[PDB]
Structure formats: structure tokens, C-alpha cells
Design a protein around this ligand. Structure first.
Ligand code: SAH
Ligand code: K
Ligand code: K
Ligand code: K
Ligand code: K
Ligand code: K
Ligand code: K
Ligand code: K
Ligand code: K
Ligand code: K
Ligand code: MG
Ligand code: MG
Ligand code: MG
Ligand code: MG
Ligand code: MG
Ligand code: MG
Ligand code: MG
Ligand code: MG
Ligand code: MG
Ligand code: MG
Ligand code: MG
Ligand code: MG
Ligand code: MG
Ligand code: MG
Ligand code: MG
Ligand code: MG
Ligand code: MG
Ligand code: MG
Ligand code: MG
Ligand code: MG
Ligand code: MG
Ligand code: MG
Ligand code: MG
Ligand code: MG
Ligand code: MG
Ligand code: MG
Ligand code: MG
Ligand code: MG
Ligand code: MG
Ligand code: MG
Ligand code: MG
Ligand code: MG
Ligand code: MG
Ligand code: MG
Ligand code: MG
Ligand code: MG
Lengths: 326, 52
RNA sequence: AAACUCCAGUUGACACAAAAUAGACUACGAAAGUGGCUUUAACAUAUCUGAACACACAAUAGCUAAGACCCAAACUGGGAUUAGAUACCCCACUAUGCUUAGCCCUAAACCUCAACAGUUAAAUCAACAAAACUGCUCGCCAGAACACUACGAGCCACAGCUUAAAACUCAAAGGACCUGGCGGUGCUUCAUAUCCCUCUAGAGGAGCCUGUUCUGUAAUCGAUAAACCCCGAUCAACCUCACCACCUCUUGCUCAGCCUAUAUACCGCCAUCUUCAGCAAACCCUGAUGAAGGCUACAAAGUAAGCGCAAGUACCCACGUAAAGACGUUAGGUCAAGGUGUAGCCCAUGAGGUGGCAAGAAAUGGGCUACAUUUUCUACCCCAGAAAACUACGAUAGCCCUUAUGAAACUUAAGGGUCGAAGGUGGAUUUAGC
């Protein structure tokens, strides 16, 4: 079982109260959505997900609360149109809970293809066939050139060995099609000496497969999570009430940066991890930020309790960024 | 600028860092189609001029 | 931002902290060190050398105890930046820097030059540093690494200091210098249809033509980043043809033949920098006759020749445009122009006949025609009349029918008829032109 990550913080943060309408742009399993419909019995809630399996769960769970929860299906970009059909263009949503990442059910079910450990079709697509033409991870690896595929790994996977892990994929695909998760994992391992398979470690300091950065990289290029995250936040702002509390959850750095640089106005094209020294050097050259539209409830990113991390290691990297619209 | 007459006075491609559009265009075309060695030290290179 | 707001400014009072200028001086001391003022004491030796351990010292940091505390400041806390943590930045503050009394005994404690005496003549001298040496004495060294380590021993030192190995391992390690490459290297001047902006017309969007890719097919090959992509072709209905299927021939058009492999064996002919100005010899001289170097015009070691540039020539000039453009670079292109080295086939990888492929789910390059009013049609070749939005502009496309060529034409070309589509001047990007 997967407990909703930081459910206690997200509930306190949004303080759901009677007379307030809320949105959920990532229903998924619905653990967070259900934790929010428990504290306040008079709450109004809206749900959304990219997975039709997740949208069916919400529809089945809608029986528990007939109108307090309203289920919707679609991507972040398509969310505004879907909600615009309802007619809530101003929205006046008190809070938008934009949980991020892959659902526990999505990656616990081997058929969905998200787990390298198990053997499933190399789908790695949050979409559940709602768009049967949407390329899957298998398609991405078999088509793109080394330079193109290396960029996917480098930019989205934070993978130093992008050229080494991409060349192995290019050679492997020629010999046979890459259609299964384990088939890819073995190819990526084959780019390195056999001992490399578990040399790398996580921040938890527990050995991880040497292809855990290629499964994350493709997952984010197949589902365009990063570009869809920028529109998703923007749409929330337009549909978010003034004085309404937004709450995001970033499990990896790339998504965390966008949430940080969006709630603070920082340009998305600035250099990453800028030090104070570099900031001085940057502006010294020019010598020769706009008003913020948010009020961060908690100034610094929250993180899961160390005890809770061991119980749910999947959510160890959950960085909660809360803000109030201005 | 003081002399001048002003008249009567009243994307995501860079965000990710990859050409996500161009990458997904090549995949669509694919979907349609289907559906070291030793080097000798130069000073030690052997010559036969003296033997000739 | 935080912090402060008994804050900040003026004025006055006020140090156990630190000592502008002088100091561009180069002094004192054994070294370490010593640069505000005064006073006291005071800077060993009438031959030199003489210690890891004796004797006495020894920056900074640090230890123990007691004081001082302006300012600085490891650490720590807060703020900020950061995906986040630490650091870099900001604020506050501590050990510590100070005094006293004990320790600790280290430094790139380095003029990286042991002390003393002597010489400037020999050879000046591997190199660099810092001109080259002689006598004499003490200390020290004997491949790299292991190793400022282990053990032993001594020490007020207890995560310490001093002295200091061996085994296993290697064929180098190392010093100086030269060249090249490279620098998130300095400065300087640059590109002239160009690196960017600026100027004009385009490409990228539409249709069509054409190449390529992919897919398809029993059914060629080669080119394929710049430097491939209307390229070998100044050109494929048969032929061409090298491909596929079937059939046929065997000293075969040839004193046979092979478009069989290898352009990474080559000649031949070229691409490319080149919208370059350099390349290769023969000598001479400098550096001690080292790797190397060789220019000063009021000239200081360079020079008599070759190739390219240049000149000259072609076109309408002496301008411009052609042509030319070395060596070298990319084992660049071409064995399928022809020839040919090497390897392979010889009833077959050779030769001949018949028929056939040469398509489009698509993607992409180049071009053509357009989207119209500076336009469309007609007359005229520039003083006109009409057209001008769903019967306008717009196909060189589709379909149908003629004609031309041919033995052969749904197929190639031209013409006519019919049809009247997308397109409404095209994002990122990009081509050409003085
Ligand atoms: N661009 C997007 N638009 C909509 N839903 C998305 C999305 N990207 C991811 N998602 C979905 O959002 C969920 C995030 S992970 C699951 C979190 C959820 N609150 C839970 O019940 O666990 C997944 O269901 C995922 O498929
Ligand atoms: K002074
Ligand atoms: K001075
Ligand atoms: K020194
Ligand atoms: K150099
Ligand atoms: K155009
Ligand atoms: K050649
Ligand atoms: K040939
Ligand atoms: K040959
Ligand atoms: K074109
Ligand atoms: Mg403040
Ligand atoms: Mg003496
Ligand atoms: Mg001794
Ligand atoms: Mg001594
Ligand atoms: Mg000593
Ligand atoms: Mg001392
Ligand atoms: Mg002290
Ligand atoms: Mg202070
Ligand atoms: Mg103090
Ligand atoms: Mg003092
Ligand atoms: Mg000193
Ligand atoms: Mg001595
Ligand atoms: Mg000399
Ligand atoms: Mg030795
Ligand atoms: Mg030491
Ligand atoms: Mg020791
Ligand atoms: Mg000992
Ligand atoms: Mg076009
Ligand atoms: Mg071809
Ligand atoms: Mg080829
Ligand atoms: Mg070739
Ligand atoms: Mg090339
Ligand atoms: Mg024939
Ligand atoms: Mg033919
Ligand atoms: Mg043949
Ligand atoms: Mg060649
Ligand atoms: Mg002439
Ligand atoms: Mg001329
Ligand atoms: Mg020419
Ligand atoms: Mg010439
Ligand atoms: Mg070659
Ligand atoms: Mg031949
Ligand atoms: Mg044959
Ligand atoms: Mg018309
Ligand atoms: Mg026609
Ligand atoms: Mg005829």
C-alpha cells in the first residue's frame, strides 16, 4: 500500500473548509483527494488525471460522495478547456493540488510498463490508450538518433553517460526491437562493465539499477511532464481564486525548479544552481525582477519526515512548495 | 529625445532544453513507416634503409 | 532579506586594541623576527670549522590557567542564493589574534645559495636559476613508490612531535628546456555580399515538377555534413541496362570473357580549404657544432635558383569577369568512363533472347507556378478598352480527345476540351547578391 505523500502537510496547508471549491489536477490513485474529502464533509472538489484508469477510479469513488467530488480526464494543457466547458473560467478555486510524478498504481502494475524491475510492455505512458497514437517509450528509443536520444537522457534524466547509454540503445534496436522493460534495462547495463549494474546509489544511499535514469528520462519525454507542468501551473493560476492556497509536490529537481521559478517569477532560461558569486559576476557585466504574484506559505521547501521516508521510500524526494495567489 | 515628436499622448522549447516539437515529429514519421588498439612508439618504428 | 531603531548625524568625553605618512629607505638581530614615543639595561668571541639527540632559542596555528575585549574571526545561529545541503554574499556572535604564567617545537622556518678563506686567470658554462671556480671543514645523499608511513625509542607533546624502515610492486621516476596542441587565456586589429545589425529578392506555408530518404517490389549501382540530394544523366517507354523471372549457348564479337571484391593497391579526371600564399631544394651563418634559430633600410646574416601567387594572356580597356591557383589537408569522390595491381568466377560471377520492375503510407532537398490591382484579358509593344472574389486571381495537376516521334505511347511531348482545387504573401530558421 502507498500512503499519500505528505498528506498531513497538504491538508493543513490547504485547510479545506466549508464554502470553498478546490481542484485536483492529478487524482491518480486518489489518496490525497480522499484525504481532502474526509476533513471537510461540506467541501466541493474537482479531479483530473491523464490516466483513464485513474479517471475510472474517481468515477467509481464518486459513488462514495455523489457531488463533493467531480471526476475529469485529460492532461494539464487540456484541463482549462475541459473545465472551460463546465463554464468555471474564473474558477475561484480556493486551492489547486498539483501532485506530480507517476502514480503508485501506474508503477505497481507491471502491465503499464513503468517498472524496470518487473517485465511489462515498454509503454511508460501515463495515458491509458485514451490517445492510441501517443508514442510510447519503445517508440522513442527505436526512432531517435544518438544525438537526439542522448539529449533526452541528459536533459530529462540528469544522466552523465548520455552518449554511452544512448549508443547501446541504438545498437540494440538494430539487432532486435526494444519492446520490453527488462530488455531496455539490460541494454543500458550493457553500456557499462557488468559490475556497474548497481554501483550507482540514490540519495537514500541504497543501490539502484544503472538504468533508473533512462526510465525517468523517457517517462518525462513520453508524457512531456515538464512542458505540461508549466501550462498546468499557469492554468491553475488563472483558475485560482485570489487568496487561494496552491500546493505542489516535486519529487525530482527538474519539476521542483519550475515550481520554484514560477512561484517566484524567476526566468526559466536562467542558469541553474546559481551561486552568490555567479550572481555578482552575472550582473557586473551589465552594469557597464517583476512583482511577485504569490505569497509562499512556507518559505522553504518541506520534505517528508525521515521516519516516513523509510515507510514510503518512493516519496522520499517529495518537495512541497505552497503559495497563495496575489 | 527632447526635440523628437511623440505625437498625441494617450517558448517551452527552451524551457526543457530540447526541441520537443522536432523530436516528436521524427517519432511520428517512424510510427507511420512501421505502422582500443595498440599504437607503436614513433621512435621505435623499424627501418630497412641500412639493410638495403 | 534579516538585523538595529537608547538608531543615525553633529559636538564633547573616552583603550590592556592596532601602530597613516616617513619607508622611492634596505637598517637591526643567530634565526624566528623587528618600522608610534620616551628612558633604563643592552647587541658573545683578537684563527677558523664543530651536534636530529648536549645547551639555548624558534612565525602562524594549538594546549593549560587567570585577565582584557575596540576590531577581526575558525565554529555556530539567522538571512539570502540554490532543485536542495555546504561554500561563495549579508547579519550576529564564539574559540582564537592581546596580557600574564606555563607548555607545544612545527612552516614553501626559502636568498629553495652550509661555515670559513681565497681567485677573476684558465675551459665562461649541460640547461634554467643567481657570472665561473679553488682550498678547508662539518652536515647530508646514493632509482621510483611504499613513506612527513610501520615498529622501537625519547619527549609537560595523548587524533602530537623527532628519529625512521621492510615486504610486496614497477622500468622507469625525476630535473631543465624546445616544439606542438590547448586555455571557461591577455591585448590588438579584423571579415565587405560578410561573423552580427543594416539593403533587395527569395526559401521555409499551397499546388505542381524533380532528387533523395523511407516503405514497397521477384527486380540495379554510385554520390550521400561542410565538399550528396535536376549529383554520374548536355537525360531510363524497347534499346540504353549494369537489375528480376524464365529459357538458351559453351574456345564463346576478341590469341576469350567478367559493370566480380578491393577507390584502404592505383593511373586517369576531380571535390575541398582556395573568397588561401605558401611549398620544396641547394648553400651560408648563429646557438660551445643541443633540441633549435636566422629580422631591423640612418639595416644587426642571410642568399644565387624552382613551383604557386604575381606578371602575361582570353573576353569590350590598364577595369571587371573568366582562366589560373603550388605543396599539403579530408586513406575525400570515382575499379560502373576507360586502363590496371591484387584476389576470385570459367557449364558461369561469362554470353544471348523473351517479358517485367522502376510504385507511394509518407518525410525531406532543389526548382516551377501562384496567391493578384505595380494585378487579369485583348489590341499595341508603353497616351487604349474591359476584367476585378464562389462564372475573379490561381494547375505546366486530374479526366477526356486529337496531333507529333516511334515498330511499339493509359504512359513521352505539344495542342484542344472539360475541370476551377489548395493557395489570400508563409513560425523557428535560412539562401543569394556590391
Ligand atoms: N500532465 C498531466 N496531466 C494530468 N495528469 C497527469 C499529468 N502528468 C501526470 N498526471 C497524473 O497525475 C498523477 C500523479 S502521481 C499520483 C498522485 C495522486 N494524488 C495519487 O492518488 O497518488 C498520476 O495519476 C499521473 O498519471
Ligand atoms: K604609526
Ligand atoms: K611605509
Ligand atoms: K622563497
Ligand atoms: K604554446
Ligand atoms: K515561401
Ligand atoms: K584518388
Ligand atoms: K576503373
Ligand atoms: K581492378
Ligand atoms: K521549394
Ligand atoms: Mg527588514
Ligand atoms: Mg663555532
Ligand atoms: Mg650527528
Ligand atoms: Mg645545529
Ligand atoms: Mg628539528
Ligand atoms: Mg613557537
Ligand atoms: Mg596563544
Ligand atoms: Mg565585530
Ligand atoms: Mg573573543
Ligand atoms: Mg598591544
Ligand atoms: Mg620567513
Ligand atoms: Mg655549519
Ligand atoms: Mg650556456
Ligand atoms: Mg629510494
Ligand atoms: Mg609534518
Ligand atoms: Mg609519525
Ligand atoms: Mg610509535
Ligand atoms: Mg514549399
Ligand atoms: Mg539510388
Ligand atoms: Mg552507397
Ligand atoms: Mg563510396
Ligand atoms: Mg563528405
Ligand atoms: Mg529487354
Ligand atoms: Mg529497360
Ligand atoms: Mg555481369
Ligand atoms: Mg580516396
Ligand atoms: Mg587582351
Ligand atoms: Mg586583368
Ligand atoms: Mg574560376
Ligand atoms: Mg595568375
Ligand atoms: Mg574512403
Ligand atoms: Mg573494371
Ligand atoms: Mg550473368
Ligand atoms: Mg476563373
Ligand atoms: Mg490542363
Ligand atoms: Mg502514330
Amino acid at each position: 500500500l502507498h500512503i499519500p505523500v505528505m498528506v498531513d502537510e497538504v491538508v493543513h496547508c490547504l485547510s479545506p473548509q466549508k464554502g470553498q471549491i478546490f481542484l485536483d489536477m492529478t487524482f491518480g490513485s486518489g489518496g490525497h483527494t480522499k484525504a481532502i474529502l474526509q476533513k471537510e464533509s461540506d467541501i466541493v472538489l474537482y479531479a483530473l488525471d491523464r490516466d483513464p484508469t485513474a479517471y475510472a477510479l474517481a468515477e467509481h469513488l464518486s459513488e462514495l460522495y455523489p457531488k463533493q467530488i467531480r471526476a475529469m480526464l485529460g492532461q494539464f494543457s487540456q484541463a482549462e478547456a475541459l473545465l472551460m466547458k463546465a463554464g468555471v473560467q474564473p474558477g475561484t478555486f480556493d486551492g489547486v493540488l498539483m501532485d506530480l510524478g507517476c502514480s503508485s498504481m501506474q508503477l505497481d502494475t507491471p502491465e503499464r510498463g513503468f517498472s524496470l524491475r518487473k517485465d511489462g510492455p515498454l509503454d511508460m505512458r501515463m495515458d491509458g490508450g485514451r490517445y492510441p497514437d501517443m508514442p510510447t517509450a519503445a517508440d522513442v528509443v527505436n526512432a531517435l538518433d544518438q544525438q537526439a536520444l542522448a539529449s533526452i537522457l541528459r536533459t530529462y534524466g540528469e544522466e552523465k553517460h548520455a552518449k554511452k547509454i544512448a549508443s547501446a540503445i541504438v545498437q540494440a534496436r538494430s539487432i532486435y526491437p526494444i519492446t520490453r522493460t527488462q530488455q531496455l534495462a539490460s541494454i543500458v547495463a550493457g553500456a557499462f562493465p557488468p559490475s556497474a549494474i548497481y554501483t550507482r546509489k540514490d540519495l537514500l544511499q541504497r543501490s539502484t539499477h544503472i538504468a533508473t535514469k533512462t526510465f525517468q528520462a523517457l517517462r518525462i519525454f513520453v508524457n512531456n511532464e515538464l512542458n505540461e507542468l508549466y501550462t498546468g501551473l499557469k492554468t491553475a493560476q488563472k483558475f485560482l481564486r485570489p487568496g487561494g492556497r496552491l500546493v505542489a509536490l516535486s519529487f525530482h529537481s527538474l519539476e521542483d525548479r519550475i515550481v520554484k521559478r514560477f512561484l517566484l517569477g524567476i526566468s526559466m532560461t536562467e542558469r541553474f544552481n546559481l551561486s552568490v558569486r555567479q550572481q555578482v559576476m552575472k550582473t557586473s557585466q551589465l552594469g557597464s525582477r517583476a512583482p511577485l504574484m504569490w505569497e509562499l506559505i512556507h518559505k522553504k521547501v518541506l520534505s517528508p519526515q525521515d521516519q516516513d521516508v523509510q515507510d514510503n521510500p518512493r516519496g522520499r524526494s517529495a518537495k512541497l512548495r505552497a503559495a497563495i495567489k496575489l | 529625445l527632447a526635440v523628437a515628436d511623440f505625437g498625441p499622448r494617450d517558448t517551452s522549447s527552451s524551457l526543457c532544453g530540447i526541441d520537443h516539437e522536432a523530436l516528436n515529429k521524427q517519432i511520428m514519421e517512424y510510427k507511420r513507416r512501421k505502422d582500443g588498439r595498440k599504437r607503436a612508439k614513433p621512435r621505435l618504428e623499424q627501418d630497412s634503409s641500412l639493410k638495403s
